[model samples]
Target: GPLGSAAAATPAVRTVPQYKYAAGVRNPQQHLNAQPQVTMQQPAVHVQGQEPLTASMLASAPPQEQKQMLGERLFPLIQAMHPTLAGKITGMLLEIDNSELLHMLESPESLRSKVDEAVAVLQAHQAKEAAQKAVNSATGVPTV
Candidate 1:
């Protein structure tokens, strides 16, 4: 006859049981069993030097096991790429890798496109720089 009237009439809001398994974060269901959920346990996993595999983190990747410090790993990659809109794409790739280690997902064609696109960009930039150098040299301007 009323919304939650029985519940309110029966009891005040009960305090929830806090669990320490995941280090005192809320675990309302409490049904989670022995095996740790990797998704929820990233910090703890890091402490153990165990992390979800990632696509970019390549199986033989020399860096995945390196210190998880920001500048030492992905953060510097972000700063270096400095891509405008495409940087987000790089972050997404890392996220996918962190969860699934799609090193398996890598295909020759897929990587080929990435390589082709990257080489094209680099070549274009280098060509422009060379053109500028030519103009400067012909005009007797010193290279910086």
Candidate 2:
């Protein structure tokens, strides 16, 4: 699982030419040359969040605007499942999104493994929200 193992093990390494990927030159299997093409560029996962994102985070929008956007988005999903629960489900979506964002800035590798965990959390909570929506829709029938 070494970074450059595939390239190193390639038959092209024997001739000292870069070979196909090497642009027609033979890539020699030099010990030092076997090093990773790019080793740990950004930051080691789980280290620290000190390094700002290579690309800027989309931190420009206001909170209310963000909520409005979410309402525009998730409202359809919620309403498709049930018309009445959109308000409550919209709130849950905001809560879950904020919680996930906070968790993201926690561990350095938050995008790697921790993101998966965050996704599971989001999924579980969203499922709960959906279930509640379904229940409310089925029940609020004015009691016949």
Candidate 3:
């Protein structure tokens, strides 16, 4: 009788195994792999061609035309070589006799030598101004 009572009093216990979900289970579809479309327009281009100007063409022209032609040619050269002295150099060249200017225009070496001389003069003047500024600063004098 005691054995039967002990058996009836014992409780039953059962274990049920649980499953883990996959890392990507039921995930929404990714739409990030889309490519963008781009359209590029071509630009229009135009070029105008002209005859080259020569010294002979310049010489045949009148004095006023010659001067204008020389100025047009020389200004670009001087500006390309020395932009800082372009205006001053142009003024100085224009002041010289036309014959001498023509000779210089015909001879690149002559033009270069004259340009170098002008550059030297400008540099000397610049140096003098810098020295004067230094003196003024030391003396507490304002520059005009």
Candidate 4:
């Protein structure tokens, strides 16, 4: 009976506070709305005496003029290095197409390397000729 009476007692009531909805409580969404602006600056161009001649300028000249210009610059150098082979090397250099010729003219080091390559080729040919002559003499057969 006593256990039934304890169960019949009313339970305590629990209370919770209600919050009101607030508008614009936090800051509005930030915007990166500024348009991108491009400022155009004039390009600066000037001629300097110290600047080397460009390949484009050389390319614009007449074919004969191009050859003459190249010869004037390269002939002395080649002659100084290899007097006998200078003509042959110059011929080799001139035989290249205009674009390649202009490039080599603009780049002195590249021109030097090409000239060296030509000299090597010529020297190798001479050696082969000598070898052929020796072989022909030993074999009692004339070279074709």
Which has the greatest TM-score? 4
Best by lDDT: 4
Off by over 4 Å in 4: 1-64, 71-73, 96-102, 130-144
Q: Over the stretch 1-144, how does candidate 1's per-residue lDDT look in tens digits?
A: 146422334333464233235755666776557586457535543344344222234434545542232112433344333443233233333333332213222332222233234434544545466344455433265333
Better of 1 and 4 by TM-score: 4
Worst 10 residues of 2 by lDDT: 51-60
lDDT of 4 by residue, 1-144 (tens): 135422324344243223246788788786766467644464555554343332333454656566554544455557655755765564456564444454466555445666667677656655566344455433365333
CA lDDT of every candidate:
0.36, 0.40, 0.51, 0.53
lDDT of 1: 0.36
- Per-residue lDDT, model 1, residue 110, is 29
The candidate, 1 or 3, that scores higher on TM-score is 3
| Per-prediction TM-score to the true structure, in the order listed | 0.20, 0.26, 0.35, 0.36
* Candidate closer to the true structure by lDDT (higher is better), 2 or 4: 4
Clashing pairs in 2: 16-26, 16-28, 17-25, 17-26, 17-27, 18-25, 18-26, 18-27, 19-25
TM-score of candidate 3 versus the correct structure, residues matched by position = 0.35
Give the residue spans of candidate 1 off by over 4 A. 1-57, 60-108, 129-144
Error of 2 at 135 (Å): 3.4
Across residues 1-144, which tens digit of lDDT does each residue of candidate 2 receive? Answer: 247423335544335433247454676565685566766566665734343321022122344343343323434434434434454453343455565444333323332233344345545656566345455444354321
List the pairs of residues colliding in candidate 3: none
